[PDB]
Structures are given as structure tokens and as C-alpha cells.
Write a protein that binds this ligand. Structure first.
Ligand code: 4D9
Length: 145
């Protein structure tokens, strides 16, 4: 199995799914490296985020736990089709890339914080990460190219 994928078993179901420790993604189907990628993301800052401040809110005061409850709620809407990544990124992302629908443009290794970079490079085109953690907050990353 490819970059950082692993067999896991469902607690509710008893069915084998697959989990990516690098991207924190999980899917049911058995999964199937480039020089540059392009990613969008939705960032939710928390009180130990680097700059606890954003265009949404001048002091960010939510805790690491509450940030992850948000990221998990957003992930549910996105995965359920009830809203899409872009619309949620524009509305809710604490990153100023919110206005470009979360788009960060194309990049290569060396450019971005490493947790984010590894997740970016381990995603497949069109694939969405689970929650990924950097000193900035907790990201949901969507690899577009
Ligand atoms: O790194 C940035 N600044 C942070 C948010 C952030 N933190 C990151 C950590 C890793 C990768 C991208 C990231 N973006 C902020 O706005 O507080 C960027 C802002 C913008 C705005 C427009 C285009 C690219 C970028 S990259």
C-alpha cells in the first residue's frame, strides 16, 4: 500500500478501512510522488496558533479542542455534500486565502510548514486530508493538482 497507508478495522462495523497517518485521511476502498502540488485549505486557528488573530476575529480564543470540533463539523458537511470545500473555506477559514476559496497556488517541498507539506504531497489529486496540525492551527487540505 502506498505512502503511509495502513489497514484498520471498524469499531462499529467490523469492516477493513484504510487510514493515512500522514494526511489523517480515511476511506473504505484500498488506496490507488510529484515535484509540485497545488492545494487549497481551510484553517481554524486556536489559542496556541502562532498568530491567535485573523480577519474573522481579532483575538482568537477558542481552544485546541474546539478548533477540532469545528474542523470535524466542516469535514462532515464537505464529505456529505451538504456544502462544499470552497464555500466553507471562504466563509470560515481563518487564513486570508479564504478570499481565494482557500487556494494557496502551486508549491514544491521546502516552501511550506512540513506537517502541511507532507500531507499535501501524500494526498492524491482531488483528495481531501483529515485534520492536520501546524503551529498555525488545524487545517483541512484539498489537493487540486
Ligand atoms: O501562510 C499564510 N499565512 C497564514 C495561514 C497559513 N498557515 C499555513 C501553514 C502552512 C501552509 C499554509 C498556511 N497558511 C495566515 O494567513 O495567518 C498564507 C496566507 C496567504 C494568503 C494568500 C496566498 C497564500 C498565503 S500563505
Amino acid at each position: 500500500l502506498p505512502p503511509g497507508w495502513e489497514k484498520a478495522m471498524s469499531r462499529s462495523s467490523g469492516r477493513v478501512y484504510y487510514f493515512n497517518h500522514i494526511t489523517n485521511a480515511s476511506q473504505w476502498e484500498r488506496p490507488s510522488e510529484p515535484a509540485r502540488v497545488r492545494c487549497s485549505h481551510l484553517l481554524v486557528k486556536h489559542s496556541q496558533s502562532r498568530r491567535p488573530s485573523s480577519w474573522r476575529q481579532e483575538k482568537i480564543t477558542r481552544t485546541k479542542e474546539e478548533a477540532l470540533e469545528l474542523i470535524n463539523g466542516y469535514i462532515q458537511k464537505i464529505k456529505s455534500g451538504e456544502e462544499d470545500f470552497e464555500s466553507l473555506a471562504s466563509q470560515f477559514s481563518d487564513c486570508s486565502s479564504a478570499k481565494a476559496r482557500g487556494d494557496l497556488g502551486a508549491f514544491s517541498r521546502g516552501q511550506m510548514a512540513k506537517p502541511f507539506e507532507d500531507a499535501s504531497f501524500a494526498l492524491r489529486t482531488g483528495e481531501m486530508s483529515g485534520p492536520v496540525f501546524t503551529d498555525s492551527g488545524i487545517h483541512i487540505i484539498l489537493r487540486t493538482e
